[PDB]
Design a protein around this ligand. Structure first.
Ligand SMILES: C[As](C)(=O)[O-]
Ligand SMILES: C[As](C)(=O)[O-]
Ligand SMILES: C[As](C)(=O)[O-]
Ligand SMILES: C[As](C)(=O)[O-]
Ligand SMILES: C[As](C)(=O)[O-]
Ligand SMILES: C[As](C)(=O)[O-]
Ligand SMILES: C[As](C)(=O)[O-]
Ligand SMILES: C[As](C)(=O)[O-]
Ligand SMILES: [Mn+2]
Ligand SMILES: [Mn+2]
Ligand SMILES: [Mn+2]
Ligand SMILES: [Mn+2]
Ligand SMILES: [Zn+2]
Ligand SMILES: [Zn+2]
Ligand SMILES: [Zn+2]
Ligand SMILES: [Zn+2]
Ligand SMILES: [Zn+2]
Ligand SMILES: [Zn+2]
Ligand SMILES: [Zn+2]
Ligand SMILES: [Zn+2]
Ligand SMILES: [Zn+2]
Ligand SMILES: [Zn+2]
Ligand SMILES: [Zn+2]
Ligand SMILES: [Zn+2]
Lengths: 272, 267, 274, 274, 267, 272
């Protein structure tokens, strides 16, 4: 017979689920690498091969604003939210200023429930392959638990009164909170965007108020804003941090687990 | 169907086209006359890239947006046409405008050739044949260029321009060089760089000065007004012109720049 | 217009890598002169003459050139640096030098980048006048290294994970295989005096079947006789030679380090394909 | 700081002679790459690639490089001069090319001087900027040519006039022997396609006895098999190889043109001695 | 009895001696402190030459009387110790004072070595051993020389002397050079050459100036009197000194000249 | 038995006689290449190996001033003058201003009598070998007759009103007269010498009076004088002409016959 078709909204999710599924399900990701996901716009093609899938996973917390309408044209397909159970961090200011922060995957302690929700989602869809999925989930959690200790151990070194993480959509609030870092971001969440210069302004000062050596951006949004801060208090522009999407198998962050390790050192060795 | 090759800009496009013959369909990411050092790829470009059977590029950080643009384009053969060429440094990063030098172009086409036979080896015979013929025209014109620029006497071989894109040209035919900014970049330039160029024309008596087709002329004109230095029009480096217009081909771009400068220091 | 400095390297691969950071600013030369066994080479006295007249001598380290220590000892003050510094070795599995570091590191473009940087620092101190060039060349070489790394991983990803087996004569490709997730099978760990043995070609004859590996390779500096053996008795296709410890002539493939990585992976990829 | 010009020569002997007038001012390179038959060489396409990229191409002429005419015809404007101009040839005795000029002229230091001068004129026009160097190098090379000429005539004058017999495989030494009054005996006039013949080795077997010649020589680019023949049947000692159409490696004798004349005469002199 | 080697002058004599060890008896034609470019061989010399088992010389027309002197000396092995070395030109004939450059001396001793084993091959082992050891000392001192002359800051590395015998030294350690006459010759010099040197000291502020032991100081002193430039004594190139006296060995000659110049531009 | 020992005063003679003697007599020359011969001073060695020779040839015309006294201490040896029969050219001025010019060998027409006198000298000394000596003399004359035509044919080209030969001891008067050349010399014959500057003066003017391009000197005397003239009317200093002695087998003029050919072209292609 044939293998079931699973479909995740974006790549970070796609890779997370690929570790739980092993060779048993064919897992594809809706969006296509380094694409803004917070507000992607689906094409008939994505809605037509979606209708031809056995299940659609998604993050929730309104990460994908475009999804409710997309799922809207798939009747033909159930869909599980991978955040089921996590206590969210509310946002800071602006528009959806008290709605959940969707970037909960950035906390390994939260990545654990994420795989749990993936597992439960499969165990049912393809019960015949319960064992595996379970074997694969155990292993993967074991790995998330591992990488989790390596991060606490990476960020501890930089002194507490220098633990400042500065970015664009500061979608790391979670990683922030896990290892006790203070957060400095130009905007709270992605959107129509185009950042005001009052924002890029607060950044110009908070980094002088706080003498932060390295600032970074991300592979989905624009570097134009931060670079300024790369031009205000000699701050060093680190490369890109990774959250709303991985990089290909070449280049860094080709797997979620790598995103985590990676983001961490360049932070760690950007504050040192 | 023929394979698709995509290159970062339009000088590369005319070059790799000449090697490709009617056996490949060759496409440039940037339009015509667009500043290439500082372009912001549209998702239109990203898709073009994905379906591309190969992507050629300059390297030497010429096209600064490429690490990023290639970031979001999985598997997709990627070669730098600059490999094997020695840079003149600029703070002291490499001057990417290597193609501006006939002797160097021979190795661009060389790397284009290597990459076309690794790609469509079924047509290997053609590429080499084209490349050999192209290479030969390259030689023919490298001379003539020398034969144009030597007329202008050794001590008035000053090449003033907006970006220092001509280092490899200057180098090749013993020309001193003067420019308002070394490399395109955040730019807007400064009043103090204009204050440096507007000095040479008198400190070395340069009748003629130029800019280039991808960057603003506003600044190089000041210098022209602040000094009895005629502002000759555009030079061409980062991009071509349209068939109508000068410089529709790389070779044309070469013969052209040299002729306008050569005369333009005469009288 | 004092002449240019003189830089000496152990083998031809290192010679092309440094010649690529130096440009026409230094004059790079090799001890071993093409396809020659670099691990147990025996320096003629011209070799020793050169060395004492060079202004700097650049070597791999990690005990690659086993003859260096001694060769070095007989030249008066002349500097020497190991391009290998900062690279974390893969240690050897068995044979003499059991847990000695695997020198074949340059075969890893990630690693090649640290090679090229140390060449850079060595040259700025050697000839600080021309620093600007070394950075500019190193920049450009570093950058072309990253291109092919990306391009290399993109070539070996084709062959499916359960067929990703790299059979060579020397385990000279252990870094390359770590980088692109291959399983290595070698006829002998590293080079050591005691010619490979028939339990060794034997072990290789079993790992192959055991994995139904379609193509098996040697390298251009060692004995094809043992690998050929496991070929006319296993059924595998003998791909030709891979290149690790030395490049090729102007003719033939691999006349440059970059060509070496490109070549090596291409003929591997299509080797285990069908 | 435009790079330096590029000069190409047919064979390695010419390469060392020109490299000696150019200095570090031009970059001299050879087509044929050591001990290789220079008379009927078959240019690979890299050879042809080089040629079209060189800024000047210097060749012997006198039909030495039989392949040149054709090789030349397929490169676009690039200059070519014959270093041989002004030298009065010795014509060939027999075989095809009967009365064709003997090209082996450089073997005569008197003649070498006209070689070196024409290299000089070619370079001043090529690169008039650096003229001063070419004269200064040519001066010094011309001068060291006169030393060894004097020194060469002083070496062959030892052996007595009625034993002054020079047996080689190719009559490549006819000028050398005219200069120092030797009688030449060759297995074949010049190189020609139709491998030497057994009436030829035969004629040589008779001229030797006929003159009780103690040592007989070959050259490093041709077949020792015929000369060795006339040796194990005549009783003469087989001196090794003389060097005409090509030099040697950094190792072995004759790594330079001057060393070539020195060597050639020394091993001849002591060859017919006792 | 040991073989006799004869060399044109006394710097060559100390060099070939060092290679020869106690296995050869080495003799110089010219005495000590004698102008070598312009000596007139006595028939005493001619006979010495005849019984010489070998004659070594500089070449590059250094010793202009040699074509003639060797004219009347039948069979007598003759080598130039200059073969393989590239000249700095001077009208534009080669500057013969090549030995003045450690990196060059290595090839003088090299040619001495080659010629000693072609001559007494029975003792070949010794020569090479000496030459290798001599060569090593050459290296040791080439450094130190650089390490002395770099102290004097890049823009006061001016070496003023009577003959331009130091070109290969100047070259080797980036020194500009000033001299009253390029090469010894008919000479007597001119008042106009003194008029050129007496200009540098002010046009480049040179505290110290020198002459050499084989040629007249009368002229270089004028310059010293016409300018606040202290006249440091003699430099040494064409010849040595006596054991008593500085510069009794080649190596000494090297270390010496460099030290006096280096300090002598200090203050 | 043994071969007879013949001894010539100087090298030009030595080589002349060596062609007539072939391998049959051992011929040595008293003086030793590029040596002033007009007034050499003999050493006991030269007088002792001379006493041990079977015959001593000499030029005559007082060329060798030192000879009468030398022959003085050889009793033990006869001696033939090789000039017997030649009509000499008297000198010009100075000391022996009307005594014969000894340099008669410079005329091939005179070199013929010279070999004749050598032949006659041998035919007797070693009659047993008459034939040879005669065969050798024929051949040699044949060669002198040859080279004689080549010279007339070499010097004709330069125009008559440019045929000026300038040297030191102008010992070429003979070569001068054979092919109609005018002669310009600093001194008429060698001697204590040390030339006055009144002489080197006449040369400075006669060359301007006569616009002579190249002047030369010789391998036995000093170049110091002429060089001046090499510094007075842009005159080109040619190398050395050869008369009172050859150069070794290396270098030019290793044989008399070569001296002649040689001297001629450099003259010829020094006036053109
Ligand atoms: C020690 As573990 C990673 O297997 O639990
Ligand atoms: C990980 As901790 C508690 O050591 O800071
Ligand atoms: C080191 As430096 C610049 O003195 O040559
Ligand atoms: C890297 As390549 C482009 O020479 O094969
Ligand atoms: C010929 As030129 C000196 O112009 O380079
Ligand atoms: C000429 As040689 C002195 O190298 O043999
Ligand atoms: C013609 As003839 C020289 O033999 O007399
Ligand atoms: C030799 As004639 C007479 O031709 O002048
Ligand atoms: Mn540009
Ligand atoms: Mn190895
Ligand atoms: Mn030949
Ligand atoms: Mn001197
Ligand atoms: Zn649930
Ligand atoms: Zn990939
Ligand atoms: Zn360069
Ligand atoms: Zn050893
Ligand atoms: Zn050095
Ligand atoms: Zn050790
Ligand atoms: Zn040089
Ligand atoms: Zn052919
Ligand atoms: Zn060129
Ligand atoms: Zn023809
Ligand atoms: Zn008589
Ligand atoms: Zn001789």
């Amino acid at each position: 017979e044939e293998k079931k078709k699973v479909l995740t909204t974006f790549t970070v999710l796609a890779d997370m689920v690929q570790n739980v599924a092993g060779d048993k399900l064919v897992v594809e990701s809706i969006t296509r690498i380094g694409a803004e996901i917070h507000g992607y716009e689906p094409t008939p093609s994505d809605i037509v091969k979606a209708q031809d899938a056995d299940l659609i996973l998604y993050n929730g917390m309104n990460l994908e604003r475009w999804f409710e309408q997309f799922l809207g044209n798939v009747k033909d397909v159930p869909s599980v939210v991978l955040t089921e159970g996590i206590e969210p961090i509310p946002i800071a200011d602006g528009p959806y200023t008290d709605k959940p922060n969707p970037h909960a995957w950035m906390s390994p302690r939260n990545a654990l429930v994420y795989v749990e929700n993936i597992r439960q989602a499969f165990v049912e869809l393809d019960p015949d392959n319960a064992k595996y999925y379970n074997a694969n989930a155990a292993v993967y959690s074991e790995q998330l638990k591992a990488i989790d200790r390596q991060l606490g151990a990476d960020l501890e070194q930089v002194p507490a009164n220098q633990r400042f993480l500065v970015s664009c959509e500061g979608a790391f609030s979670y990683l922030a909170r896990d290892y006790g870092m203070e957060e400095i971001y130009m905007w709270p969440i992605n959107a129509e965007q185009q950042f005001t210069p009052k924002q890029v302004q607060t950044v110009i000062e908070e980094v002088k108020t706080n003498n932060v050596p390295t600032i970074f951006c991300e592979s989905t949004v624009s570097d134009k804003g931060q670079k300024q801060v790369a031009q205000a208090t000699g701050a060093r522009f680190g490369g890109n941090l990774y959250v709303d999407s991985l990089s290909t198998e070449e280049g860094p962050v080709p797997t979620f687990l790598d995103l985590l390790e990676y983001d961490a050192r360049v932070i760690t060795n950007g504050l040192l």
